[PDB]
C-alpha cells in the first residue's frame, strides 16, 4: 500500500 | 442445395450442428459442441443474418463494433460458410497489425472449428509460416500481405480480404487500403471487409465510396473512474502499489496493468510476484498469479494469459494479473477483467524531420487510448479504472487524438516501397490522409537525384537494393557504394552512428566539461570521424573493464543511443552478408585511411554541401545563410564543408559538419 485515490466521473452504460 | 454467395443464416446454423464437419469430413468432438454453445452468445451472431444480407449485395463494407464483440474470430467463419473456398481453390486472409494477436487468434479459430492448426486455418508471420496447401483461412500480419502483394500484384490467390483493427492506422494498413481501393476495380470477385473498433466511422465510408456500415450495439457496463490527487514522480512503484492495494481490498476480479516494454514488464512481474508472496505470508491473502504479455512471447507462453484465476485457499478471492503492453487495448480481449490500472505512458514511434531518424520514445497516450483502456475495465460486471495522474492532467495535458503513422514516418522509404508494388502516379495516389504535396515532391526529387529512381520514375536495381535496408535511402546508397573506396567498415560504422538520435548531451550547466569530454574523442577534421572514434572507444575492452554505464555517464554520452547504434550496425552487417555485398577495410597505419573515409563520405552527402563565405557559410542547395554550430570540432577554415543537420533559430546553424577537398566533389 501507499497510494490514495480520489473518485472521479462515471462512464454511463452504452446499452 | 448449397449456393455460393446466396446462403442464409439459418442454413449455415443448421449445417454447423451436423455430425460431420463440412470442411474436412471428420467427426465433431464434444469440445467443439461446448465451444459453440459458449460462443453463440456473442453480439455478432445476432446480426449474422444482416451481415450476410450486406456481404452479398456489395463489394466493400465497413463493420464497426466495440472491442470484444467477436469480430476477428467470428466474421471469417461467416465468410467461409458463405464462400465455400475449398470448391474454388481460394483462401480468406485476415490482416492483424500485431503478431501476437495474429498467432493467438489463429490458434483460437483452429480450436473453434475443430480442425488442426496449420491444415485448414493457419497464420503467416515473418520467419513463421504456419500453413499448408490445405489452408482455407489465413491470419497474416499486414506487412506479410503487403509483401505478398509485392510478389503477386493482383492477389489472385485470395477471394476475400479482411482488414482488422483499421482504427490503428498503421503504415502498412494505409498502403493496403490505398492499394485495394484500386485492385477492386480490376477484380470483380474480390470482396473486402474493413473492420474497426470505433463506433463512428463516417470517414471510412466516405473514403470507400459510401460503403455500407454495420454497427454492433454497445454491450459494456458502467465503469467508475479514479484519479490521484497529486502528480506521480515514479509511476512504476505507484503501479505496483496500486496493484497490491487492488488485490488486497477490492472484490473478486482480475486486474489488467498497462506498462511500456519488455524489461519494465519483467521487472514488474518479479516485483509483484515477490510482493504477493510476502503479502500471503504476512496477511494471509489469496494467491495472485502473474502473466506477462509483449510482442516477442512464444505461443506456448502467449496462451497462458487466458488461464483461469487460481482457486482461493486463504478464504479470500484468488486473482490473475496480466502485465500487458498496448496489446490488451484493442487487439485481444481477456475475459474476467474488472479492474484496470492505467499509468498513462505507452511506447510510440516518433520521426525527426531534421535528422531523419525514427525512434521509439515513451510518451503520454491520447484521450481515446485512455478511454479505451478504461472501457476494458467493464465487460462482465461494473468495474473500476484507476488512473495514476490528476484529473486536470487528463482534461488538459493529454492530446485529443494521435496522428496516423503515414504522417509520422519517412516519406522517402514509403515512396520507395510503393514503387515496388507497381504504382506509377504517386502524386495522384489516393491516400487515407495524404501528406502535403510539397514533402511528396521533395521526396521524389531527392530519390531521383540519388539514382534510386531513374529519369522515367521507374525503379532500378540500386533502388531496390537500398530499399532492402532499414535506412534513409541516402545512407543506404552511400553504404552500397562505399565498397569502391576501400573503407567500407568505417562507413558502416558512421552510418550506424548517424541513424540514431544524438549521442551527445550538452546541458547549459557544465557545458565546458562536456566540450572537453567531446574533444577527448574529437579529430581535427570533422564531426563525422568523431562518431567513428566514439564508437571505437565504446566497444574497447578498456571501457568494459572500467564499466560501460559509468564510462558513458562520465563522458557525457547517451548509452541508449550507442546501444541502438551497435544493434543497427550488427543488423546491417548481417544484411550485407545476406546479399553478398563486398566488404573491406584499409590498414589503420596507412596515411590514406582518413582520405579514404572522407572520399567515401563526400560521395554520399553531395546533396548537402556548404561553402565558406568571403566574409559565415552559404549552402550550395537553396542558398541559405548559415553559421557553423558552436558545438563543432572544426580545426581549420574548411573552405568546403559537409553538413548533416539543419538547426533553425534566430540565426541559422548547421550541425555535424566536416571538411572536404573540392576535388572530391
Ligand atoms: N485464445 C482464446 N482463448 C479463449 N477465449 C478467447 C481466445 N481468444 C478470444 N477469445 C474470446 O473470444 C472473443 C474474441 O472476440 P474478438 O474476435 O477479439 O472480437 P474483437 O476483435 O472485435 O474484439 C473474446 O470475447 C474472448 O473472450
Ligand atoms: Mg480483433
Numbering used by the authors:
A (entry chain B): 122 to 136
B (entry chain A): 52 to 666, 669 to 718
Anything the authors wrote about it?
A cryo-EM map of the Prp43:Pxr1GM complex at an overall resolution of 3.3 Å showed a defined density for Prp43 residues 52-718 and Pxr1 residues 122-136. No density for most of the N-terminus of Pxr1 (residues 1-121), which encompasses the G-patch (residues 29-72), was observed, supporting the idea that this region is highly flexible and only transiently interacts with Prp43 to stimulate its ATPase activity. Despite incubating the Prp43:Pxr1GM complex with the non-hydrolysable ATPγS before vitrification, the resulting density map showed only ADP bound to Prp43. We found that the I-patch is anchored onto the RecA2 domain through a set of hydrophobic contacts and extends towards the RecA1 domain. F126, within the -FKVGE- sequence (green lines), clusters with hydrophobic residues F437 and L439 within Prp43 on the RecA2 domain. The I-patch (residues 128-132) adopts a β-strand that is anti-parallel to the β-strand of Prp43 (residues 274-278) and extends the β-sheet from the centre of RecA2 domain. This involves contacts between L132 of Pxr1 and V274/L276 of Prp43. Another cluster at the C-terminal end of the I-patch involves the indole ring of W136 and the side chains of R270 and Y272 of Prp43, present within the loop that connects RecA1 with the RecA2 domain. We found that the RNA-binding tunnel of the Prp43:Pxr1GM complex adopts an open conformation in contrast to the activated closed Prp43:G-patch complexes (DHX15:NKRFG; PDB:6SH625). In this conformation, the C-terminal Ratchet and the OB fold domains are rotated with respect to the RecA-like domains resulting in the repositioning of the OB fold domain by ∼24 Å as compared to the G-patch-bound closed conformation.
